[PDB]
Amino acid sequence: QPIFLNVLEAIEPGVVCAGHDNNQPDSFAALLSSLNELGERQLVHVVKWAKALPGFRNLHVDDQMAVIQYSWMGLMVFAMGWRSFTNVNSAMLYFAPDLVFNEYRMHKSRMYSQCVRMRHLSQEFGWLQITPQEFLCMKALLLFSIIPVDGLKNQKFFDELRMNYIKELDRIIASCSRRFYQLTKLLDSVQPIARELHQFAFDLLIKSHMVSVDFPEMMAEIISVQVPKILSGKVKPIYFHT
Amino acid sequence: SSFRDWY
Numbered sequence: 001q002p003i004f005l006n007v008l009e010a011i012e013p014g015v016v017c018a019g020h021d022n023n024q025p026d027s028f029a030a031l032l033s034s035l036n037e038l039g040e041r042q043l044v045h046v047v048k049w050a051k052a053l054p055g056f057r058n059l060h061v062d063d064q065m066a067v068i069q070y071s072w073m074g075l076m077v078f079a080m081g082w083r084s085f086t087n088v089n090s091a092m093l094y095f096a097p098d099l100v101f102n103e104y105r106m107h108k109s110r111m112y113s114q115c116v117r118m119r120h121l122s123q124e125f126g127w128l129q130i131t132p133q134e135f136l137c138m139k140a141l142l143l144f145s146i147i148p149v150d151g152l153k154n155q156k157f158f159d160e161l162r163m164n165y166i167k168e169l170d171r172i173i174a175s176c177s178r179r180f181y182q183l184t185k186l187l188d189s190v191q192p193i194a195r196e197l198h199q200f201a202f203d204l205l206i207k208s209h210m211v212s213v214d215f216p217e218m219m220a221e222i223i224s225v226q227v228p229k230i231l232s233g234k235v236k237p238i239y240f241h242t
Numbered sequence: 243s244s245f246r247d248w249y
């Protein structure tokens with residue numbers, strides 16, 4: 001209905017491939033070198049996506065940059081889970097066309113637990129009957145769901161921008177009331193999974209010269225600089241419920 | 243950063 005919904009649609013990225021050799025077998029190293037590359041490509045995309053968000057150019061440049069690096073994994077997880085719901089009805093993990101996980105890739109990549117978790121999420125799209133427009137507006141907010149305890153450079157704008165994003169989600173909803181608790185519940189559950197993945201990538205990064213996994217330019221930096229912040233409690237997610 | 247640079 002509104003202008004808002006046109007934008008989220010319009011700006012929504014397209015198909016992004018990982019370029020995986022689906023012919024050779026499933027080594028850890030092969031698998032995770034392609035996820036890192038998948039991370040790298042989708043990040044670019046989250047950047048060009050986010051810059052085009054409504055209200056986004058109201059934040060201090062450093063705030064923009066920050067808010068993005070902190071929330072990228074959280075977003076990645078969400079659309080991944082939509083993708084896996086929408087293509088394969090949550091039967092497997094749809095990272096990309098050329099990189100769909102099956103239980104075997106799940107266990108060989110060594111992320112079985114986190115993978116189990118994200119498959120649960122994908123299911124929830126279906127269980128809770130998530131409309132495409134509910135998906136987009138939920139996604140938009142996740143970028144505004146994670147800040148330093150310390151606080152952003154222009155914190156007022158953020159608070160404001162966010163408030164209007166929560167408003168638009170409520171608008172696209174409005175015993176209906178319980179839909180919100182559900183949708184906020186659902187967003188809230190994204191944060192644990194992004195933390196687990198933060199940890200594993202973090203671990204992985206450190207051991208990586210000594211297991212032969214490829215960490216792209218942008219990968220190695222974000223993980224070693226901004227990820228630790230989150231894992232040390234310096235940077236928290238905003239939760240709806242307690 | 244090399245992030246600050248391409249942004």
Ligand SMILES: CC(C)(O)C(=O)Nc1ccc([N+](=O)[O-])c(C(F)(F)F)c1
Binds near residue numbers: 077094
């Ligand atoms: C940093 C680590 C290996 O790259 C990673 O978790 N990569 C990654 C790549 C792509 C995607 N994706 O959205 O399809 C995801 C995940 F968001 F699903 F988990 C992670």
